[PDB]
Nucleic acid binder design. Structure first.
Length: 109
RNA sequence: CUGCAUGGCUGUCGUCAGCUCGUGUUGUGAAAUGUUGGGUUAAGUCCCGCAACGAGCGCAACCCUUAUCCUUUGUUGCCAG
């Protein structure tokens, strides 16, 4: 079975035409997805996440959005989970050459 | 003979707050960014914040000196005891 109950939103006024893979009709105050074929909307993405997670890969969780900032910090127990949730810096993944000296500052201070 | 040849030697914009670099980003590229912006300062000084994060020179700090008390040594100055 391809459900897997994961979505209950119905989007009552405004939509994006890029959502056409999931939305198969819209009549009267709804832009609702297909809820009986939900698994193919994420199965390949979670299979790739499972492949990375089982090949010692490091997983970064991002949630600066206040609703979930304290929720995204807990998901793993033995796998390499990392998170950012209160605040970012400019070039915090790209300028790691400079961030790796601020990681020292967190204990040197 | 000669400070548009050079040393030496002395001034001034100027103790002014000015001046840039790496990494990361951007633009075809020279080059920009940071250094703009907010509140400020003696001041690119300090805190706050974003595609920027950090570093250094000048600055800051540190130096010589002044008003005051405590303590001590004294003449052919001073005379308190």
């Amino acid at each position: 079975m391809l459900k897997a109950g994961v979505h209950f939103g119905h989007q009552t006024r405004y939509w994006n035409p890029k959502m056409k893979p999931f939305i198969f009709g819209a009549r009267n105050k709804v832009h609702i997805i297909n809820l009986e074929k939900t698994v193919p909307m994420f199965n390949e993405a979670l299979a790739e996440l499972n492949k990375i997670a089982s090949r010692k890969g490091k997983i970064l969780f991002v949630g600066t959005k206040r609703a979930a900032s304290e929720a995204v910090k807990d998901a793993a127990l033995s796998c390499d989970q990392f998170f950012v949730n209160h605040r970012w810096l400019g070039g915090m993944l790209t300028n790691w050459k400079t961030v790796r000296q601020s990681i020292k500052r967190l204990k040197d201070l």
